Structure formats: structure tokens, C-alpha cells
Subunit: 289 residues, 3 copies
Amino acid sequence: MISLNGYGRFGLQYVEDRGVGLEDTIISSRLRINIVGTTETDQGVTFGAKLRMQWDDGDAFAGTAGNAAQFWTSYNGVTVSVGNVDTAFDSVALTYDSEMGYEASSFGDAQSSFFKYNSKYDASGALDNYNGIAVTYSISGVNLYLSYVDPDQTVDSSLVTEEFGIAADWSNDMISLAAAYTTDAGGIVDNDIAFVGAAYKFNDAGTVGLNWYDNGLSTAGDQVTLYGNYAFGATTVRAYVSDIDRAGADTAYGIGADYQFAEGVKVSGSVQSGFANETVADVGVRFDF
Amino acid sequence: MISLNGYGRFGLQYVEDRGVGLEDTIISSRLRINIVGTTETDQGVTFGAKLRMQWDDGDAFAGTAGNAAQFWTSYNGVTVSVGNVDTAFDSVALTYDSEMGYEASSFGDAQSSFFKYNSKYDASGALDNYNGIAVTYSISGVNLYLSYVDPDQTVDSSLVTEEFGIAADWSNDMISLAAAYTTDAGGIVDNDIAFVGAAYKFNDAGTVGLNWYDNGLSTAGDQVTLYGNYAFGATTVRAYVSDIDRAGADTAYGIGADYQFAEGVKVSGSVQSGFANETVADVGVRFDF
Amino acid sequence: MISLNGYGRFGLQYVEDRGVGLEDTIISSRLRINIVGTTETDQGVTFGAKLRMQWDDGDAFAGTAGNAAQFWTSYNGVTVSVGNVDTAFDSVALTYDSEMGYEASSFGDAQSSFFKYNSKYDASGALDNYNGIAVTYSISGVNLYLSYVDPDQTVDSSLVTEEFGIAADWSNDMISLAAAYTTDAGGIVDNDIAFVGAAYKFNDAGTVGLNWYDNGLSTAGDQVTLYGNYAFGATTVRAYVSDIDRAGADTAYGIGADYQFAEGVKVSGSVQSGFANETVADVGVRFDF
Ligand SMILES: CCCCCCCCOCCOCCOCCOCCO
Ligand SMILES: CCCCCCCCOCCOCCOCCOCCO
Ligand SMILES: CCCCCCCCOCCOCCOCCOCCO
Ligand SMILES: CCCCCCCCOCCOCCOCCOCCO
Ligand SMILES: CCCCCCCCOCCOCCOCCOCCO
Ligand SMILES: CCCCCCCCOCCOCCOCCOCCO
Ligand SMILES: CCCCCCCCOCCOCCOCCOCCO
Ligand SMILES: CCCCCCCCOCCOCCOCCOCCO
Ligand SMILES: CCCCCCCCOCCOCCOCCOCCO
């Protein structure tokens, strides 16, 4: 069986003083199509493959192509994946929950470099022999993630730096906990990064959370992000504040809101301020199909 | 929801004396696939996105890719679109009704340069930040079209020439009228073009029409095209004659026929002669799927 | 109507002493998606078009694109195809039946160069104006194939070498016979190649066969491949031995097995040795969707 799913999003993206002779406000949009082939068996083992076709405004050649494939095998709560995999630091829960606006961005997200699923082709040729293996398991309300990424599988392994990561999250109805660690993140020797987060569902309506990072070799240093959200009917309000160790950085912050216009249709906007005082704002829609 | 539709066409395309050491007759073919994602809401607002994958014989690299996306929102007869939009001069009725043959061509089509939906990627990099906005409305048997195209939305607007167009068409059972105007067509300063057309359905079987253009800065100058068609059962016969102001140009003309072999299957051919005496002929099929 | 089908395969591919500073064992995988549009008519003539999107590990840019299209028309057992066609030497039965392992390879396959359906784009620009025509017919348990491939249809024909091929196969329940011949194979003047094969189904379970080739201008010279397979429940065992005329070449051979894990899911592996003593091995899965 082959299924197709995806989403479109478009709206206004504003970046204060974007650049000499550049407009500060543009129309930023994205079309994402996922192509999934699955083979179910009577033995309970499911095999699958996926491809993504993603277009973003500004893309080179005004064209869209597929990325590199991902393959998986699932059996009894265990999933093994190969090729262009989802990585542990990028898949744990809570680490991206301060994101807001129609482009789901936040200066409070980790400031480090690490491998993650590649949505598009890479013209530099850097990903041509990139191959990963990942294993996930949901044991109880516990989720475990493991990933191994080799940036160039064809070359003798002693010449390349491979990325290894682990993560786990756990949740009941009101508290959630998550942690991750990855060594040689992004294939950079000694760029070891870690995450610990927790969130409290202080209502069916509200949530407050705190994420802490060790950003490895990034110039940002350690980081802490405190964020929260509250739902009022169809509208959700969100906010966050984040600090990094880099000398002289400002405190980043943002405030935004989502409006659930209909099932699959979300209108969002946000106003944020970064670590270097950058001012960014957005407003737009996302529709799922 | 995601739907796929398209067509294939193949046949013979002949160009008298195409070129030194070139064959005059080749097999010209096209495969077009449209990918449409839509999200319907109970509020009556529909959101959609579309992507096209088009291959034509002769294309570079013997490969096919997607173009740049188009997004829209429809509500009560009004449609707003963003990104790679359909433009007003390219969408009005009547302006392409002299086209004939399996590749739907005509020297009687307007000889000017103007933006229109881009079916494919552009290797020159000229379309990378091209973004348009369009609005259509069917008020009665009236159709109104408006389009705004910015060839490079990232650059300060005083440095770029934007294209603005309007058009309207109207029809009852026997007369149709259409007009369009576009300023700085194709992003070329002072290339302002206009169209006025009318057609008379002198039967359930026949139609005669006349289109007039102002081709802006093109060397063709003003143009007039008189065309007609008549249906005899499953076969339709078509003809046209067109004249442009360019000094020394010949009168262009063409005669062709369509045969409706079955629903979705059309066999067509034509013999045409251009403004510079070029002789072109074709015969082939198109099937819709 | 538009349908999508395909397969994914992944596993380990081992090549003894692949190269200085290279790993001998890598994870080799492929994702293939076929896009087929068809228009059926009440007259019994079916029209179709197809596109392929294929990704293999190692591909340039870590991306996937469509290839060049293929068009066909079928009526009463006769199929005419145009564009990126299937060729006669590549479509006859028996010629690839010694292939084994999850990547279906065999040194016993013909060692010659000839045109065949192109699964992907070609960055060299060599296929940009490549166009073929093919005709197939199943008259009784007989299959006939004819193909004509012009490597550059736009250029005067006396300047290009076109490939012409024919083939036929025939089968009852226990014997199969096949033959093919192609002149100027692969567009190489005087590279004329031929195939004759026969197979004996000495059981419902076993088969032994013999293929003979004339490899035209290849340095391999004439070749003979003797192969066999035997099914034991869900597992199939296969073997082959092949010899070529090239002076000093070794005898190639291989042994492998397939395991039908479920409908659409096949686990395969093989160990093979080539004409230059290369040692290659594989183990992996293929799933159809
Ligand atoms: C095989 C899938 C198609 C992907 C091929 C695209 C190849 C394009 O690059 C060729 C070399 O030129 C360099 C491109 O410039 C950067 C492109 O990507 C960035 C998106 O904005
Ligand atoms: C060129 C300027 C236009 C670009 C700016 C887009 C800015 C739009 O977003 C502002 C809205 O952000 C949300 C504010 O937080 C309050 C939410 O609650 C109020 C209404 O539900
Ligand atoms: C058709 C008239 C010319 C249009 C003026 C050009 C001005 C450019 O755009 C300004 C902003 O308006 C359009 C954008 O569509 C995205 C809006 O936000 C999404 C819904 O929440
Ligand atoms: C990202 C979508 C894939 C589109 C990328 C194609 C990029 C190819 O160009 C790279 C630079 O080389 C120039 C190409 O020659 C012209 C191609 O287009 C014309 C069609 O016949
Ligand atoms: C190399 C020469 C072959 C290429 C030429 C293709 C020419 C085929 O088209 C000629 C047919 O055009 C239609 C003529 O107008 C008369 C229509 O009514 C008659 C039958 O229904
Ligand atoms: C298989 C024998 C070799 C074929 C001869 C090569 C000659 C090249 O083509 C000549 C014209 O015929 C084929 C084209 O298919 C398109 C025909 O028109 C479409 C249906 O109305
Ligand atoms: C139009 C469809 C997209 C296909 C375009 C890809 C164009 C890429 O090449 C541009 C020129 O650079 C040369 C590429 O290197 C070889 C690529 O193919 C081999 C697969 O491993
Ligand atoms: C780095 C080494 C790993 C790569 C080698 C893969 C080798 C795996 O394939 C060996 C199996 O080949 C099949 C053998 O023939 C006997 C079949 O019958 C026995 C079980 O059903
Ligand atoms: C997650 C721990 C790190 C993984 C070790 C890296 C070693 C690389 O791979 C070794 C072989 O195992 C994995 C391959 O998946 C394909 C196996 O064969 C397919 C099923 O028949």
C-alpha cells in the first residue's frame, strides 16, 4: 500500500533590519508531501519506506525533488529504521515545546548542531553516503530512542566520526520528563550534547515546562528555557524565555498564539526577540491534508 | 486529502527546415502530473496546495522534478492564491481559443511576454524568489481576475519591477466577451499589454471569434486573430488567420481538426504557417487520467 | 486513473577488498516508486503513461527525481510504446534467471552493453533526446518483442547509430525457449549481440537452464551460463556457473537462497565469485507495496 499525506503553510515573516537592500517582510511558505509505502504481514511484522518532497520559498531553481529514503521494520512496539533516520536528540518529547508562530520557531530551542532527518536533497554532496540506523521502543508510557549516524558509510570507519545518541521520555497525565545525550553530535569530534526537560500539566488547559541543555562545542554554552502555554477554547497562548552562557548575550523571549480554525487548520502568529537582540515576527496558516 | 490527475500526449511534430543537420520531424511528447492537497472545513473555507511534475521530450538530464508550489483559500466564489499563481492575462477566456493540433499551438495567440504559472523548475535561478498573489471571483456569468507578481520578493521593492494585471470575461449561451490589461508585463518596465476578444456561438455546432492585442514592447506590434471552429459529430474542424503590425510580416494561418475518440482521449492534427513563413505540422493524441 | 506501486529493499552488501581506505561491507538499499496513469476506453484501447522515482544509496545529492516518461497504447494483445521504452534484449524471458541475492545480481547475466529502460535521470546529458519505440505481442504462449532506440532523435539520422532488436520466448508447463538479437546494441556500431536460452522445469519444484550469448564487441567474448533452482517450501535455493571466452578469465559461480517470509516480503542472500576472482556477498530483504 502507498499513502500520501502532507501540509501547506503560508503567511508573513518579518525580520527587523534583515539586510541592506532587502525587504524585512516577505511571504514565507512551505509545501510538504510525504510518500509512504507499507507492507503488512500476517506475522505482525510491518515493513515501510518513506520519501519526502518539500518545497520552501527561496529554494534554488524554483523546483522540488525527493530526499533520501528511510526504511523501517516494526514488530511488537519495536521499530528498527535505516537510511535517512530520525535521531534520538531530535525525536525525544518536550525539547521543541516552546516553539510558536506559524513556522514553529523558538530561540529557546537548543542552540547546538546535531544530525536529524534530512527533509531535502543537499547540493554540496555532503550527504551522498550518509546512512543511519535507529531503534525506538515504547515500553509502558516510557519511550526509548537510539540512533547511530555514519556521515560516510563507504569510507573506512577510523577516518570518520560517527554520531551516537540516546534519549528517553516518560509521561503520566500531569508530569513529563525527558532526557537525551549524543556524542560527537553532527559528526564533530567532542561535540557532546545533552538535554533534560520536565513539564507540569497544571490543568487540562495549562502547561509550564523547563528544558536545560549542554550545547557541546557551540559558542552558546549551557542554556535554560522556561516556557508555558494556556488554552482558552480554540485559542492557545504561548510564551518562553531562554538564556545561554555566551558572554554579553541578551535574554531571548517570545509570545504567540494559535487559533484552531477547524480540524487540520491552524492560524498562528508570534513576536520573538533573540540572543543578539534580533526582532522577528510572523503570522500565517497551516493546513493538513 | 491528496489527489493526483494529469495527462500524457505523444505524436509527430514537423518543422520545415528546422536546422542544419537536424531532423525536421521528431516525436514530441509530454507527461503532466498534478498533485493537489485540499483541506475542506465545516465553515465552508477550503484550503489547497498544488505541485506539478511535467516532463517534455528534450528536457535536460532526461529527468522530471516538481515546480514551485501554489497555495489557495476559497470561500463563497472568491479564491485567493499565493506563490506560483495563475495570472490574469493567462487565465481570461477566449485568448487561447484559436489553438489547434495535439500540442494546442497557434501563431494567433498573443505575441507578447508576460508572467504565467510556471510548470517547471528554472535552472537559471531567475525564479528562486518569484512570488505572486492572485484573486479570482465569478460574480454571475462574469469572471474577474487580478494578479500581482513580484519577480524577487526578497529585494527592496523600489529596485524591482512588479507585474500587475486585471481581466474579466462574460458569457451567455451565444456571445462571449473578454478583456485583460497588464502593466510591466513579465517584469519589463513599460511593457503594458491588453486584450479584447469576442466570440459568437452561431450554432450549438459552430463558433467564430476575434481577438485583438496590444503586444506592448514586443516587435510584433498590434495583432488581430480571427478564428473559427465547427463540430461534426465527434470531429471538430478549426481554422484561424492572424496579422501583426511588424513591417514585412506574412499573414499567419492554420487549419486543423480534433477527433474525440472516447471520453478523455483526443486525436488532433494541424498545419500552420507563421509570420516569417515558417511551416509547422503535427498529429498526435492526448489522454487524460 | 493514477496508480502508485513500488518496493523497498535494504541489507548488507560485501565486496572483498573493495578499495584502499574503503569499507568492504556497506548497507545498500533502494526505494522504487512507479507512477502509472491509464485511460481505458469502451473501444478496448487502453492508453498509459509511466514515471519512475528511484533512490539508491550513494546517489548524488542525497535526492530523488523522476526519470523520462514512457507512453503506451494497448489493443487486443498488442502494445505499442514510445519514449523511454523497454527493449527486446532486456525484456525476453530466461536471460536474467540466474540472478540471486537481495540485489538480484549474477556474473552469469550477459556481459554486453545494450540499451534498456532508464530508471533515473542522467546528469551527463547523454539521454536528453533519447527516444525509442517498442512493440510487444503475446500470440499464444509465444511472446514477441521489437524495439527501436534512437539515442538522439533531433539529429539527422545518418549521423547517429540507432539500436534495433528483436526477441521471442515460448513456454509450456515444462520447457521454455528464448532468443534475442540486437544490432548496434547501445548505439555502438557493429556491437551485434544475440542470446539463446532454454530451461527445463524438471519438477513443480526444480528448474535447470542454460543461456548462451554472443557479447558483440565486449572483451568478454561468447559466454555460457548454466543455472538451477529448487524450492523447499518457502525457501528457494539457487546456483549458477558461467564462463566467458576472455583469455585467462576464471569460471564465475554463485550460490544463494530466497525465503518467502510473507506475500510481498522476500529475504535473500548470496555468495558469488566473478571472472576476475572478485568475491561478493549479500543478505537483505525486499518488500513490495
Ligand atoms: C537528484 C535529485 C535532484 C536534486 C538535484 C539538485 C541538484 C542541484 O545542484 C547541482 C549543483 O549546483 C548547486 C546548487 O545550489 C544549491 C541548491 O540547493 C539549495 C536550496 O535552496
Ligand atoms: C510587516 C508587519 C507584519 C508582519 C508582522 C506579523 C505580526 C503578526 O503577529 C502578531 C500577533 O502575535 C500574537 C500576540 O500575543 C497575543 C495573543 O492573544 C490575542 C488574540 O487572540
Ligand atoms: C492584489 C493587490 C496587490 C497585493 C499587494 C501586494 C502587497 C503584498 O502583500 C501584503 C500582505 O497581504 C497578503 C498575504 O497573504 C498572507 C496573509 O496572512 C495569512 C492568513 O492568516
Ligand atoms: C531542486 C529540483 C530539481 C531541479 C534541479 C535541476 C537543477 C539543474 O541545473 C543545475 C545547473 O545546471 C544547468 C541546467 O541546464 C538547463 C536545465 O533545464 C532545462 C530543461 O530542458
Ligand atoms: C513527416 C510528415 C509527417 C508529419 C506531418 C503530420 C501532419 C499531419 O496532419 C495533417 C492533418 O491536419 C488536418 C487537416 O484539415 C482537414 C481536416 O478534416 C479531415 C479529416 O477528418
Ligand atoms: C519498429 C520499427 C522501427 C520504427 C521505424 C522508426 C521510424 C520512426 O517513427 C515513424 C513514425 O511512427 C511512429 C510514431 O508514434 C506516433 C504516431 O502518431 C500518433 C497516433 O495518432
Ligand atoms: C530535472 C530533474 C532533476 C535531475 C537533475 C539533476 C541534475 C544534476 O546534475 C547537474 C550537473 O551536475 C552533475 C551531477 O553529478 C552526477 C549525478 O548523478 C549520479 C547519481 O549518483
Ligand atoms: C561482513 C560480512 C557480512 C556480509 C555477508 C553477508 C553474507 C550473507 O549471506 C550468506 C548466506 O548465503 C546463502 C547460502 O547458501 C545456503 C542456503 O541454504 C541454507 C539456509 O536456508
Ligand atoms: C545502534 C547500534 C549501532 C549499530 C552498530 C553499527 C553497526 C552497523 O551495522 C551492522 C549490521 O547491522 C545492521 C543492518 O540492517 C540490515 C540487516 O539485514 C537485513 C535483514 O535480513
